[PDB]
Amino acid sequence: DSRSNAPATLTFENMAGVFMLVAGGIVAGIFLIFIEIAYKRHK
Amino acid sequence: GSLTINEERSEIVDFSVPFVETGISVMVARSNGTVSPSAFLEPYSPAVW
């Protein structure tokens, strides 16, 4: 049949660019919250 | 009345001169403006969902 319905569907590319933002949240904080924890805690 | 002149019938009966200018045309149902979103989940392919 002939349809050509919807001149888009948001790619799984730009959302990855959005997915990359939260990923940096998952990777960054732990390393700080773990490593720097040794410093501010003892002295 | 509305009698369309023709060659298939001018044989078995005569015909006078016409008094109109008619053509043949196609008539179709009304013109309507309606949108086509099937489901609201349309803007996103299920790959991202």
Swiss-Prot record, chain A:
It is found in: Cell membrane; Postsynaptic cell membrane; Postsynaptic density membrane; Synaptic cell membrane. NMDA is probably regulated by C-terminal phosphorylation of an isoform of GRIN1 by PKC. Its phosphorylated state is influenced by the formation of the NMDAR-PPP2CB complex and the NMDAR channel activity. The chain crosses the membrane at residues 14-37. Heterotetramer; the NMDAR subunits are modular and harbor tiered domains that function in concert to regulate opening and closing of the cation-selective ion channel pore. Forms heterotetrameric channels composed of two GluN1/zeta subunits (GRIN1), and two identical GluN2/epsilon subunits (GRIN2A, GRIN2B, GRIN2C or GRIN2D) or GluN3 subunits (GRIN3A or GRIN3B) (in vitro). Can also form heterotetrameric channels that contain at least two GluN1 subunits and at least two different GluN2 subunits (or a combination of one GluN2 and one GluN3 subunits) (in vitro). A hydrophobic region that gives rise to the prediction of a transmembrane span does not cross the membrane, but is part of a discontinuously helical region that dips into the membrane and is probably part of the pore and of the selectivity filter. Belongs to the glutamate-gated ion channel (TC 1.A.10.1) family. NR1/GRIN1 subfamily. It is linked to Neurodevelopmental disorder with or without hyperkinetic movements and seizures, autosomal dominant: An autosomal dominant neurodevelopmental disorder characterized by severe intellectual disability and developmental delay, absent speech, muscular hypotonia, dyskinesia, and hyperkinetic movements. Cortical blindness, cerebral atrophy, and seizures are present in some patients. Neurodevelopmental disorder with or without hyperkinetic movements and seizures, autosomal recessive: An autosomal recessive neurodevelopmental disorder characterized by severe intellectual disability and psychomotor developmental delay, involuntary and stereotypic movements, spasticity, and inability to walk without support. Intractable seizures manifest in some patients. Component of N-methyl-D-aspartate (NMDA) receptors (NMDARs) that function as heterotetrameric, ligand-gated cation channels with high calcium permeability and voltage-dependent block by Mg(2+). NMDARs participate in synaptic plasticity for learning and memory formation by contributing to the long-term potentiation (LTP). Channel activation requires binding of the neurotransmitter L-glutamate to the GluN2 subunit, glycine or D-serine binding to the GluN1 subunit, plus membrane depolarization to eliminate channel inhibition by Mg(2+).
UniProtKB/Swiss-Prot annotation, chain B:
The chain holds residues 508 to 556 of 1233 of the full protein. This is Glutamate receptor ionotropic, NMDA 2C. Belongs to the glutamate-gated ion channel (TC 1.A.10.1) family. NR2C/GRIN2C subfamily. L-glutamate binds at residues 2, 4, 9. Glycans are attached at residue 32. It is found in: Cell membrane; Postsynaptic cell membrane. Component of N-methyl-D-aspartate (NMDA) receptors (NMDARs) that function as heterotetrameric, ligand-gated cation channels with high calcium permeability and voltage-dependent block by Mg(2+). Participates in synaptic plasticity for learning and memory formation by contributing to the slow phase of excitatory postsynaptic current and long-term synaptic potentiation. Channel activation requires binding of the neurotransmitter L-glutamate to the GluN2 subunit, glycine or D-serine binding to the GluN1 subunit, plus membrane depolarization to eliminate channel inhibition by Mg(2+). Mainly expressed in brain with predominant expression is in the cerebellum, also present in the hippocampus, amygdala, caudate nucleus, corpus callosum, subthalamic nuclei and thalamus. Detected in the heart, skeletal muscle and pancreas. Heterotetramer. Forms heterotetrameric channels composed of two GluN1/zeta subunits (GRIN1), and two identical GluN2/epsilon subunits (GRIN2A, GRIN2B, GRIN2C or GRIN2D) or GluN3 subunits (GRIN3A or GRIN3B) (in vitro). In vivo, the subunit composition may depend on the expression levels of the different subunits. Interacts with PDZ domains of PATJ and DLG4. Interacts (via PDZ-binding motif) with SNX27 (via PDZ domain); the interaction is required for recycling to the plasma membrane when endocytosed and prevent degradation in lysosomes. Coiled coil: none annotated. A hydrophobic region that gives rise to the prediction of a transmembrane span does not cross the membrane, but is part of a discontinuously helical region that dips into the membrane and is probably part of the pore and of the selectivity filter.
